[PDB]
Structures are given as structure tokens and as C-alpha cells.
């Protein structure tokens, strides 16, 4: 799986 975060 995988993902991200940011802003």
C-alpha cells in the first residue's frame, strides 16, 4: 500500500 501527506 502507500500514501502521502502534505500541505
Author numbering: 234 to 240
Text of the article:
Extensive studies have identified that many RNA-binding proteins, such as FUS, hnRNPA1, and TDP43, largely contribute to this conditional cellular compartmentation. These proteins commonly contain low complexity (LC) domains that can drive the full-length proteins to undergo liquid–liquid phase separation (LLPS) via weak multivalent interactions. In this work, we directly visualize temperature-sensitive amyloid fibrils in the liquid-like droplets of hnRNPA1 by transmission electron microscopy (TEM). Our work bridges the liquid phase and solid phase of hnRNPA1 and illuminates the functional role of reversible amyloids in the assembly of stress granules and the pathological risk as intermediates en route to irreversible fibrils.
